[PDB]
Amino acid sequence: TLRHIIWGILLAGYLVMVISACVLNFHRALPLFVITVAAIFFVVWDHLMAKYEHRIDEMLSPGRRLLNSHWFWLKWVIWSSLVLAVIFWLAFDTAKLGQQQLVSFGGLIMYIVLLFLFSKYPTRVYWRPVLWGIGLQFLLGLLILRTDPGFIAFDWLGRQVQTFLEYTDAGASFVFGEKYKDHFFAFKVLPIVVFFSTVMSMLYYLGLMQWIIRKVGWIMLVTTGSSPIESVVASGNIFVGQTESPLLVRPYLPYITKSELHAIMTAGFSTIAGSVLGAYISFGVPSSHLLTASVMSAPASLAAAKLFWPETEKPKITLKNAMKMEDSGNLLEAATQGASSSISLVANIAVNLIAFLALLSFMNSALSWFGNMFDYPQLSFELICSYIFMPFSFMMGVEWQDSFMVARLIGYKTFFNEFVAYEHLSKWIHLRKEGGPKFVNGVQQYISIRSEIIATYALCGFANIGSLGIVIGGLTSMAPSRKRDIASGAVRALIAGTVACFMTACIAGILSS
Amino acid sequence: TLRHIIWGILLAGYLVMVISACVLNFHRALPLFVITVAAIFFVVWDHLMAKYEHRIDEMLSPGRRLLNSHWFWLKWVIWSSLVLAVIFWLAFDTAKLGQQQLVSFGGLIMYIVLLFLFSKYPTRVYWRPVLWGIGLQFLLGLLILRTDPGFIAFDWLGRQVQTFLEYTDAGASFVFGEKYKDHFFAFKVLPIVVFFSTVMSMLYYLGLMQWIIRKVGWIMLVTTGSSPIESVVASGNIFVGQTESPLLVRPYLPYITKSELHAIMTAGFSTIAGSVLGAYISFGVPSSHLLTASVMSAPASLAAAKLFWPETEKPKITLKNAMKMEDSGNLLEAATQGASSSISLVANIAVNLIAFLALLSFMNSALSWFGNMFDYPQLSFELICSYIFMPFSFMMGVEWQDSFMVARLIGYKTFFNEFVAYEHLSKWIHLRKEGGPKFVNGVQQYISIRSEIIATYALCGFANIGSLGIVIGGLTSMAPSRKRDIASGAVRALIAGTVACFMTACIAGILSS
Amino acid sequence: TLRHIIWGILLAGYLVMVISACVLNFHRALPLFVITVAAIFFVVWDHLMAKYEHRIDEMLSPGRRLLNSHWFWLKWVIWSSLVLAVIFWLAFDTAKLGQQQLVSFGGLIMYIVLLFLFSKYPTRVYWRPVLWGIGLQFLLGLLILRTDPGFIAFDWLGRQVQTFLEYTDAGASFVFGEKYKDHFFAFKVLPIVVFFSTVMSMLYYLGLMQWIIRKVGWIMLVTTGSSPIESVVASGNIFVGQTESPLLVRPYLPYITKSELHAIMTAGFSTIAGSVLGAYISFGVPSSHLLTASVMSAPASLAAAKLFWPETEKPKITLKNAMKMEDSGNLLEAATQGASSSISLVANIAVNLIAFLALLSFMNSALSWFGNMFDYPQLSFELICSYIFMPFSFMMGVEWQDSFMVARLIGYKTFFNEFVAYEHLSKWIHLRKEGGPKFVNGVQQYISIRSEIIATYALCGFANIGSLGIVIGGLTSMAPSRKRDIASGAVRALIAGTVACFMTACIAGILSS
């Protein structure tokens, strides 16, 4: 009762400091005007969330009883109003590009069919997530790709991440000298993994990382109707990695079902971490699209995993987000516990990219003299992955000249880890920013403006076949009483995870121009 | 009974080898003449410590019975003889510098008052450590700062550490090539942390590190009268770090009191390790002063922590130094176990200085555009820490032109780890060794000869708010039955630790010239 | 019953792919013709190993009953036929070099005598391993050093490892930039340790590493008659390191005898890993000889450890190779679990070579001013190790001009780890490949063609006194119920391990020219 006088008037003195700089020079005051008004607004929308929780059931009830009675009529309307909304909107994507963008919508159905025919419970599909999970990310993607204020936001939210890429050049220029531009990956990019792992833990300590997960999750919960753990983990995988998302719900992991656990694991493969998020940007990948792909992969993780292995028995656990809590004492412990957790994280990244990129040049040279058998060198591992994933590359709506070159990146990401796929993307990002020739002799040498947006989304996921060993061991270290359930669902989780990356990837193909 | 014939005559053959080179060319024979005579002498002073332990109680008793009877007179003399000794000596520090050196003595009382008014047991203070703990380091500091043979010793003991800074350039030039001068921190300085962690474990295996702790501790024990574990840990923190000092007494950690545990933790924050001791010297910090600060911080750790959280119940454990033992089989295991323990030690240092130095340039740029709100960039994190710790900087006797610039280092050391504070000190050490301008436009650009001695001592401690997370987890991993006692004393340990660094820092301010 | 139709006809489609490229251009088709015929052949020799296991006892029995009856005659023949075979062959090594190659054979007996006089069970020696364990590696060494098709094999098998040294330059040029030739050890050589630790685990997952151990082991088992765990571990130490070889038999480790455990530990010291095998080649060491030394050290490990601490009680365990099994799910988990196990492996190597190479230049400078006492600098640690191991260096048949310079490498390998010994060898490999002067002033400056083959074999082992701390802790972490047995045998294991390296080293001295 005594502490809040100090902390309150100081934060009320902050409200003095907001309105002080709001009066003079308001145009430079715009980010502080927007945030602190919303910072007042979201506390009000959360303090009245619990205080008016009585009226939350009292005001939602007289319509919902009428909505259940009108569901005899509404299920013939709302299920048919959206189909008319899609087909009318398919008259207005053809003006963008009739060639490939119809194939992307033709592929988005085909990825559903590739999961529905190969799901293990086809008749047990509860279609309310798996249609609306595409309906979320499409309504999410049409806001933040197609509409202009949504493009202004995630560009600016993308570009201010790019300023954090500069803030680590105080640390990486110090621990590694002024020559840190030499040896550019381990000395620039791996400090970004350290600095984002120390920001992610500060935001997790301050509750801000727990807060967005409870807001993105609850929006994704009620609209999809999944289990209340799964909406936390799938929305949690936007920010934290594949091995830290079930750590959010780790007291509740032995109690979930096999499909509630499958969709936890799939959402781990379907997205990237906020830790390695700035590693990918520093290669040269567009930050605005890669942030976009992480957000849309959370409803895609529901729309793929609840379609590929649906839930039957009972979602036994409710209200695990409010039970989800921290730990660290102060802020600078959490900035240290975030950095000391980045010890093994930048080490396992660095030795995989020694291990896996050498297994390129092994397999690019082993299959070279295996191809030299038939008078045919230029038979490489990269050429074989192009023709294996020529179906999935063209299915998500890539031009035929670039469908062969993007299918290397799916082959890089599925077999090897996705860092192999992103700088080999960023060798082709950076090559087209330079004004360069397309075909030097016959090599495609870059992709496009267009399908580098799609190949950004097709890789935004940890869904290599290598992380199946880490996620099994990561989940068995949490819930060892379900080791039979975790290991049996992991192989089903990659394909549901890789398609969940692709279901976001074709939505850019629908929304390309 | 058979082995000591081999080991004895070989070491007696060493005594032949001493006196051989002692006869011819004695002037080059001085370090071997001094050590091996003392090596005979300290074995004699320890073999007769146990053999004449009967007379140790028989000869100390007839005076101590008279000393207890004369304590009716001696407590009016010795408590008043020292006060007359101080005030007469305050007539002979003013000739050095009357401006700031009186403020340092004015600050040393003020740091006592800042702990005594904010101790939790003010009436329960047993003043025999907390006055003599300043009386030790002052008698220790006046010997090794003021007097000329004490200056010759710790300069030479400082300069021969600087030769170990060269000995790692066989290893760091090999593991990291001849280009190791590029990327100077991780490739020169972090091998010094490895090479000093492998020397510290060899000296711990050979007993030499256990021996100085039993000699510095027992001198600090009887003169302060603290608990016999605490005099081991506080003197142990001279050499080993904050997370290895309670490992010395780890079978005895669940049995200590809450204040015996507080002063264990505070001495961990109040000092530096011998591991990172050569990291600090390689930046450019004077080695003779930094070794001096580590020695004086052990009685300062008693004089601060027994003042800030005194002991009431009962010191239940005696003779834990002789119970303190190892482990490793041979010497070269201990040179490996010291190097393999330096895996996480140079890794957690390297990622913190990526994490924390980026959180400078985050907060130096976040508060820049927060200052740009009020038409005021150059509002940085560095400027705010200057005015927050302008009290403590000027209190320990720094010039007003340099009190603002040194208070950044306290702000660097309290919030971030002290490696941030030392190279930002060594940017200003190295800038004044070059003949440079003081004010370029208005920036102070270095400090002085004088207050770089004080700022050396104000930072010789692990007392950041970040290590409160490591020391809690480091002590809970040892004595998990006292987790409530450890976590409640850690916040009290930093302030008692940061002042214990400062109580050494003002003594250089008294002894500056 | 359904899966083998897919996997069979695909591998039968591979047999189509073999014979397709076998018809046209057979000269380029030679490695694929040799392997896949043998790949058919070894499956046939293993499918008929179990199917005709009934006739394996039915056809071996009518001769063995006659062999036991003729052993009254055969033990006077075969024990005397080999002695006549040796002495006749000692008439035909003198034509190669009568000076030093007789000393190598004179040393090979002397190493037996140095183990037999200092074994703890001299009367309990079962001489059937310890004579035939030299008889294996001599028959193994005469095939692959002396004979010309055996030289063609291990050169080509050596040179195709040298191609894997190039394959890591896709990974090390990426994680560490194009400037990775700068800082040549940690940025080129330590990725080779990563890439070979990720190949070794893939070959262990595919069974190919388990297969050669079951073939080299069973050949070494029946011919030596050791315990069936020990023939797995000693042959296993050809490939995996000292801390992963008892991990092969870790469910069976509390049941072995003290001498079965001694020879497990000794074989760990006597050989090198396949992990650090390409680290040694990248320094400049000849790959064909270093692969040769790893193969011959497995029978040398039997011939030394069963001689130095023989087995008395009972070999209680049989058929542990077939019980030896994995783990990892797919291949790319095992390529990740091999890389993530190389985290601590390249870190403990990198900090030891910071720790140990600095303890050269410490001891090279501490003994320098200890030598300056007697007007004698150039008294170094390197000079003392030359005269300590002048016996063992000349005993294995090195020229007297080079016996002093090679004995530094034994002193480098016994006290410090063998990476110190190999690049200080490869400073002298690389110096003689350049056309250089032998004596600049008096320094030998390289060795020879000849004794760099011997010094390659004298170092192919983990038998430093530093790894006694890792192997004790590595075995106690596996079988903690035998900690008294492991710690008592480790000191006996180094000397039996260092001689087992030397027993291979003198065989090159016999086979030098």
Residue numbers in the entry:
A (entry chain A), B (entry chain B), C (entry chain C): 101 to 426, 429 to 615
Quote the study on this structure:
To date, several nucleoside transporters in mammals have been identified and classified into two SLC transporter families: concentrative nucleoside transporters (CNTs, the SLC28 family) and equilibrative nucleoside transporters (ENTs, the SLC29 family). Human CNT (hCNT) 3 (SLC28A3), one of the three members of the SLC28 family, is classified as a sodium–nucleoside or proton–nucleoside symporter. Compared with the other two members, hCNT3 has the broadest distribution, substrate specificity, and transport activity for nucleoside-derived drugs. hCNT3 is also an important mediator of drug response and resistance. Previous studies have shown that the truncated isoform (Δ1–69) of hCNT3, named CNT3ins, is an endoplasmic reticulum membrane protein with nucleoside transport activity.
